[PDB]
């Protein structure tokens, strides 16, 4: 099973297009937003909390139409944001799979796979239309229409649409099951999705003081360290992103350019076994997701995974877990270094969305040939062990040989896991499709 990504869209902290996101990347920049000191935050803090006022914050807004949409402006001010910014990227990344493509072959079937929060707005105070009751007033949640149904609605597609959430991997999640959906012919191509926008904004987030609960994973300095010695937790940030993926036999046969290939995707559940509770990852359970993708990947990609796209989400602990499912990953397979990497320093935590920005990395790295390293490493996390192993994370660019390929994780609350390898479209007897 092979699949070709060929429509892209994304609105992440720092970068709506994807030449934004591959130079805030390359150029080791932080795109984290910082607020001016609130002088009444409008609540209480616990007594071992703080409000760090820093959020990874989009614009995706600035350049939502709700006319492109049949949306008058005021419908559109009551209507979640995530609901708005998401029909956006899925309509742009399905014209963007139009460009580079020999005319007259609709993708339709078009299935819609998107991994998404919960509608946070609709409650908060930043929702305008937040009154004698109706039938249309009294369910805002029963009529909360799903976002990816909302999508296929505007958007005129016709496939199978699932909107899910597996937490922060929910974007691999739903890839996954795009994947999934193709190979089982039910549509002929698919939005695969991901969208996070939280509500209310408050120009930051609460978590614990330095040194306290360390189920806080809200960094208390405001900084996310990916596998660096500073570690401290991650910091929150909204995003959206969609790819347009068909099975490679139809990018052959219709004459598409691709951006990058899919070689191998699995997903797993940690399950109970091997795992401290709810909210620590099982490295038992990533390694066995990560073998699951390698394997179906096949041999040859095995021997040339060169550079790994972790979570990476910078708790000193989560990372040494991730670490640890790699290192048992691959001695499993064995039975030459390995670079690693994250996004998550750069962009934040955009928690549903996460794995789509991750996965639109690995894509640009294969299409030009280098790998971002991480933005600001300094001494490791003497936790991950990486001395005398194969690993080591990514301080500065990595050029890739052709063959090279990239994997990628995604990791979610409650024990579940994604893994996807992916390899340059030359490889593949096709035309690479340029980001910019």
Known sequence: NLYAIVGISCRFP????????????????????????????????????????RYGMIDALKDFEPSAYSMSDAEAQTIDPQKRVFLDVAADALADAGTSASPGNPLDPVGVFVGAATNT?????????SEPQSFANHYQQLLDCPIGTFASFKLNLTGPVVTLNTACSSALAALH????????????????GGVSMAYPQEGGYV?????????????????????????????????????????????????????????????????????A??????????????????????????????????????????????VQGLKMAFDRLSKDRIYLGSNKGNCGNTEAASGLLSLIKASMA??????????????????????????????????????????????????????????????????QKAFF
């Open 366 to 431: 294969l299409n030009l040939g280098v790998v971002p390293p991480l933005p600001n490493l300094a001494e490791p996390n003497p936790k991950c062990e990486f001395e005398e192993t194969k690993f080591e994370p990514l301080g500065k660019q990595l050029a890739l040989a052709p063959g090279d390929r990239v994997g990628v994780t995604s990791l979610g609350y409650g024990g579940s896991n994604a893994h996807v390898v992916l390899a340059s479209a030359q490889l593949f007897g096709v035309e």
């Open 177 to 192: 099951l795009a994947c999934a959906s193709l190979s089982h012919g039910d549509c002929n191509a698919a939005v695969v």
């Open 121 to 129: 707005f609709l409650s908060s105070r930043d929702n305008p239309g």
């Open 207 to 275: 978590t614990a003081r330095p040194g306290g609960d360390s189920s806080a994973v809200f960094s208390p300095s405001g900084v996310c360290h990916p596998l660096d010695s500073r570690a401290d937790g991650c910091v929150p940030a909204d995003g959206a992103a969609a790819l347009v993926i068909k099975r490679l036999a139809d990018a052959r046969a219709d004459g598409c350019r691709v951006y990058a290939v899919i070689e191998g995707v699995a997903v797993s559940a940690d399950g109970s076994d091997d795992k």
């Open 277 to 322: 509770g709810l909210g620590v990852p099982s490295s038992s359970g990533q390694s066995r997701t990560v073998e699951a993708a390698l394997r179906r990947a096949g041999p040859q990609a095995l021997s040339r995974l060169r550079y790994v796209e972790m979570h990476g989400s910078g708790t000193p602990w989560g990372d040494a877990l991730e």
């Open 14 to 53: 720092g970068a709506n297009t994807a030449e934004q996101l591959w130079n805030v990347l390359m150029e080791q920049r932080d795109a984290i937003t910082t607020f001016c000191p609130a002088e009444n935050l409008g609540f209480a803090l616990e007594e071992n909390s703080v409000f760090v006022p």
